Design a protein around this ligand. Structure first.
Ligand SMILES: CN1CCC(Nc2cccc3c2cc(C#CCNc2ccc(C(C)(C)C#N)nc2)n3CC(F)(F)F)CC1
Ligand SMILES: [Cl-]
Ligand SMILES: [Zn+2]
Length: 196
């Protein structure tokens, strides 16, 4: 079964935000608003901002899940490739098959859905730190988009869901992801492509 990707702000006005990191050759993560697409390097920090108009209840959580963007691939579970699932690089929380990890949160939980076999990672959410206006989650993507036998050059979306403590939907947003060696050049190219 395919989870919904429909944007849904919900009662709390939930939506994502991204830093403005530019497209320099050295950038490790960069987001294209024009493409709604995040470009990032393998296993590097990807900051994703969480925004709401009003604070949801304590016990609200935020889940990330990858799905293939193309129609003929969306029912296939997005997972790490045969090489990376075997490279013994788990931090002790993330199963080695999971593409998306959360960096720097010991309360991250990883789900293998018993019915759909899809992977997700979920963390508690908290109000912003003093002097900040949003919360930030640090994600890591653990395969390249080009990894053969995994994503296999197929585009993916990350679906971010705001959930109550039972897992019921409160909000949903999403963005395309390319995991690549030079995010800055690839963002410029695809943006110049779109422009042409
Ligand atoms: C004008 N107002 C606009 C919205 C601003 N608040 C936010 C702005 C941006 C992000 C925000 C928030 C709030 C949350 C959150 C949560 C859920 N947990 C949680 C835990 C503990 C507690 C307390 C009360 C301390 C306890 N006990 N209350 C909630 N988040 C994260 C989320 F939901 F977006 F992921 C505040 C000002
Ligand atoms: Cl930018
Ligand atoms: Zn891989």
């Amino acid at each position: 079964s395919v989870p919904s990707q429909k944007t849904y702000q919900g009662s709390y006005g939930f939506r994502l935000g991204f830093l403005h990191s530019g497209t320099a050759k050295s950038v490790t993560c960069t987001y294209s608003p024009a493409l709604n697409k995040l470009f990032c390097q393998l296993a590097k920090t990807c900051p994703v901002q969480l925004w709401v108009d009003s604070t949801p209840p304590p016990g609200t959580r935020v889940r990330a899940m990858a799905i293939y963007k193309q129609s003929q691939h969306m029912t296939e579970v997005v997972r790490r490739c045969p090489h990376h699932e075997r490279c013994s690089d788990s931090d002790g929380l993330a199963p080695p098959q999971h593409l998306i990890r959360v960096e720097g949160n010991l309360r991250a939980e990883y789900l293998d859905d018993r019915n759909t076999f899809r992977h997700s990672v979920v963390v508690p959410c908290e109000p912003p730190e003093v002097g900040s206006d949003c919360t930030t989650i640090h994600y890591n993507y653990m395969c390249y988009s080009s990894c053969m036998g995994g994503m296999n050059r197929r585009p993916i979306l990350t679906i971010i869901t705001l959930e109550d403590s039972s897992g019921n939907l409160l909000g949903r947003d999403s963005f395309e992801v390319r995991v690549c060696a030079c995010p800055g050049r690839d963002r410029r190219t695809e943006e110049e492509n779109l422009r042409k």
